[PDB]
Design a protein around this ligand. Structure first.
Ligand SMILES: *[C@@H]1O[C@H](CO)[C@@H](O[C@@H]2O[C@H](CO)[C@@H](O[C@@H]3O[C@H](CO)[C@@H](O)[C@H](O)[C@@H]3O)[C@H](O)[C@H]2NC(C)=O)[C@H](O[C@@H]2O[C@@H](C)[C@@H](O)[C@@H](O)[C@@H]2O)[C@H]1NC(C)=O
Ligand SMILES: *[C@@H]1O[C@H](CO)[C@@H](O[C@@H]2O[C@H](CO)[C@@H](O[C@@H]3O[C@H](CO)[C@@H](O)[C@H](O)[C@@H]3O)[C@H](O)[C@H]2NC(C)=O)[C@H](O[C@@H]2O[C@@H](C)[C@@H](O)[C@@H](O)[C@@H]2O)[C@H]1NC(C)=O
Ligand SMILES: *[C@@H]1O[C@H](CO)[C@@H](O[C@@H]2O[C@H](CO)[C@@H](O)[C@H](O)[C@H]2NC(C)=O)[C@H](O[C@@H]2O[C@@H](C)[C@@H](O)[C@@H](O)[C@@H]2O)[C@H]1NC(C)=O
Ligand SMILES: *[C@H]1O[C@H](CO)[C@@H](O[C@@H]2O[C@H](CO)[C@@H](O)[C@H](O)[C@H]2NC(C)=O)[C@H](O[C@@H]2O[C@@H](C)[C@@H](O)[C@@H](O)[C@@H]2O)[C@H]1NC(C)=O
Lengths: 406, 397
């Protein structure tokens, strides 16, 4: 982006005898290189310049906290409107490098492009062209790499072609996935030329044969060569939420087992990877396994006696004299012996259950009520639950609300 | 990982006539599978519970933002204390996958470990180990990959060993650089085992042989096979801030003139270097099949036109009733005078164009003032910088 010496150099003259130059350097650079100010006479003569250290930089700022300013004086006997001095910096030693390139051994073939996919049933034909007689198409060979959209490039299958197309089939692709492919051009083993391969083409992207998107997929197993067979597979996040899969394995015929525990990991935004470690205690004897991912026996055990929601009680209102009493019955349970607790509530019509007189009774079937307001409409509800050590549950829904007036 | 239908299920019964269950699917899952509630009568016997949609979830929360809650009613005569029901959920269709695996065709050997570098003069001995008669060291082959720290793994050089050390020299390594290496285990070609390599060891770093830090390094030129030879190289930022490098080429009776390539594109690689690129045009590769390519300091000069960079000498000054400033040098003069407890950015400041003289107003019959001047040109195609101040001169009024 332009040396610091060259940025900081300002050379001003008295237009009679002098030129004074001021330029700087960094210490950072000087631990590696030093440079002289050089002035040049004609297309040939290049004269050194005599500078000494200056503690200041009054003509230009130096962008770097570690500058070493210079100040130099160059004698002259002449100045004319057209005069231009040309200034340079020579480094303390020769620095450089060379390479002798034999073109035939330094070929980077052009990158493929116009990458394109067409389905033919369950195969996909991948075409591309290359912009190109020193390098003929027969010098070329192509390298295609493909992976599911959710995978590293790290882990991807290659496919080689001597022409500029390849067919990808069901031996290469898993069904109902999005695949990505890319292609680069390589020199042919047979070419009289070598170098290195092109940069990759841009990516093309496509869906494989539709199949069933719910099916778990990509079941893989690898044996450590000792005592463990590690299997992994994927299933859609949404399907794992309605279905519990297990891993089951059994030796192929010469009793069928569940692998446990299964660990889980995100795999992109739609799949979960699960892993399992199958123990193999004798790979010599039983060295072929048949392994399945399939629905587990996953049950919620629900003990009836301990999950009872009784039916709501029937409720009625009674007078008898001028004192009113609430009564309530619950459906006969064949002959069960089971204590019941009831919760009883009543409302002034113009008021809210939330803030109401809510007494609670074990094994009672009525409740006498206090005296109450002149000619008001009233409401009442009851609910039951079991209340005995063999038993448990939730309240019954409320009885129908029973109205009435004074 | 309980499923949503199962986490959600609650079944309460009236201990007389039936069981009521409530539970929930998600909309998201329903796109891929629906599920039926199932009540297991006995070991051999499952039966479908008929559920229908509910607006609510009066018995358990649903941990998805879009559930499809159900309410089922299963009738029963008969209940008693010892009773446990087993409930589950059947998919709308068979789901599964099945791989049949022969262990010898499916082996992944163990990750290498304990990567070390030792130096042997200018070589580096990398060692490691693999913790294992089913799989034996002789089944094994090690693939080692290495690279400069600042490079990607994309096409790093592989070196293969069939024992658990490898050597890396100056043939493999750029001097004065930091190398990172990792190793993984593979099945030997001649092994009757097949599978896939181990995952990579942890990385190890080391500093390659020192060389001449200051040189440009890593010149690479590649020819596209038609008309162009792209070249790249690295120079250290320190050096780059002192030397402009160029790229020069000559193609292979007597030899031709050595030519300069441009433009040179620059990009910031790693902490120490910047990377440069140049495009060389090659017209007749079948005749000039060899190009010697050099990176060296260029003719990078600053053109300074004398006439537009004049700074003059300070004028000479004097002072001589009224006091008069006179000076000797198409000029512009600035004249300053001052009081003695006041500085200059307080003092009176004045421009005089092609005057060599200046008269002064009333002054204090007490004080002893100071005065400087300086100059630049006005000559019309000319420019420069103000002169230094003239000798500051004194007098007592
Ligand atoms: C570029 O030019 C400068 C100054 O001339 C060099 O910096 C100086 O390098 C000298 C070696 O020629 C050092 O001299 C030594 O000094 C010690 C005590 O200070 C003496 O006992 C002994 O006789 C040495 O000769 C000197 O220390 C150093 N100046 C500084 C910064 O103090 C420069 O060398 C390089 O620059 C600096 C930043 C230092 O780190 C150097 O050692 C370094 O190599 C010259 N650069 C090159 C690459 O040739
Ligand atoms: C799980 O079962 C649910 C609900 O029964 C299925 O979703 C439902 O699919 C019905 C298709 O059978 C859709 O009803 C349709 O209405 C439209 C008009 O709006 C008609 O064109 C069409 O012929 C039907 O009459 C309905 O869209 C849908 N119900 C809900 C609440 O979404 C589900 O099937 C799957 O989900 C959607 C994408 C469906 O439309 C189907 O194409 C799809 O397979 C069942 N799950 C599965 C995997 O079968
Ligand atoms: C595994 O690596 C060994 C140690 O480096 C191999 O020996 C070397 O590899 C070459 C085979 O391509 C061989 O010609 C070299 O001269 C030899 N170098 C040294 C100094 O060890 C070994 O190769 C086998 O054993 C050698 C001695 C030869 O007889 C080869 O024909 C063998 O393939 C490799 N191990 C095996 C058994 O594959
Ligand atoms: C690139 O060109 C050819 C057409 O696709 C391939 O030739 C094939 O050679 C096989 C030899 O055993 C053989 O199956 C086929 O007859 C033939 N394929 C057909 C019918 O088109 C070629 O494969 C190479 O050719 C053979 C002779 C060997 O040299 C192999 O090592 C080659 O792989 C194709 N590409 C590659 C790289 O495989």
């Amino acid at each position: 982006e332009e040396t610091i010496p060259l940025q900081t150099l300002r050379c001003y003259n008295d237009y009679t005898s002098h030129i004074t130059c001021r330029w700087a350097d960094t210490q950072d650079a000087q631990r590696l290189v030093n440079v002289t100010l050089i002035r040049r006479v004609n297309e040939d003569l290049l004269e050194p310049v005599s500078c000494d250290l200056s503690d200041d930089m009054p003509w230009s700022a130096c962008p770097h906290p570690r500058c070493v300013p210079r100040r130099c004086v160059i004698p002259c006997q002449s100045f004319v409107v057209t005069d231009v001095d040309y200034f340079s910096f020579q480094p303390d030693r020769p620095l450089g490098t060379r390479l002798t390139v034999t073109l035939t051994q330094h070929v980077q073939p052009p990158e493929p492009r116009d990458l394109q996919i067409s389905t033919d049933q369950d195969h996909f034909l991948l075409t591309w062209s290359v912009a190109l007689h020193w390098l003929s198409p027969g010098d070329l060979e192509f390298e295609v790499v493909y992976k599911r959209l959710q995978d590293s490039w790290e882990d991807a299958a290659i496919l080689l072609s001597n022409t500029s197309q390849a067919t990808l089939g069901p031996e290469h692709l898993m069904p109902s996935s999005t695949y990505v492919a890319r292609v680069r051009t390589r020199l042919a083993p047979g070419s009289r030329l070598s170098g290195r391969p092109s940069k990759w083409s841009p990516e093309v992207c496509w869906d494989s044969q539709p199949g069933d998107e719910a099916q778990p997929q990509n079941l893989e197993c690898f044996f450590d060569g000792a005592a463990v067979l590690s299997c992994s597979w994927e299933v859609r996040k949404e399907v794992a939420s309605s279905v519990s899969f297990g891993l089951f394995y059994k030796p192929s015929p010469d009793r069928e087992e569940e692998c446990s525990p299964v660990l889980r990991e995100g795999l992109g935004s739609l799949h979960t990877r699960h892993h399992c470690q199958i123990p193999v205690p004798d790979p010599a004897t039983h060295g072929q396994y048949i392994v399945s991912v399939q629905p587990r026996r996953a049950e919620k055990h629900i003990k009836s006696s301990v999950n009872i929601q009784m039916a709501p009680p029937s409720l009625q209102v009674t007078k008898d004299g001028d004192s009113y009493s609430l009564r309530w019955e619950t459906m006969k349970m064949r002959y069960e012996h089971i204590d019941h607790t009831f919760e009883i509530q009543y409302r002034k019509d113009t008021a809210t259950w939330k803030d109401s007189k809510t007494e609670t009774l074990q094994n009672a079937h009525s409740m006498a009520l206090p005296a109450l307001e002149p000619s008001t409409r009233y409401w009442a509800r009851v609910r039951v639950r079991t209340s005995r050590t063999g038993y448990n549950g939730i309240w019954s829904e409320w009885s129908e609300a029973r109205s009435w007036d004074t």
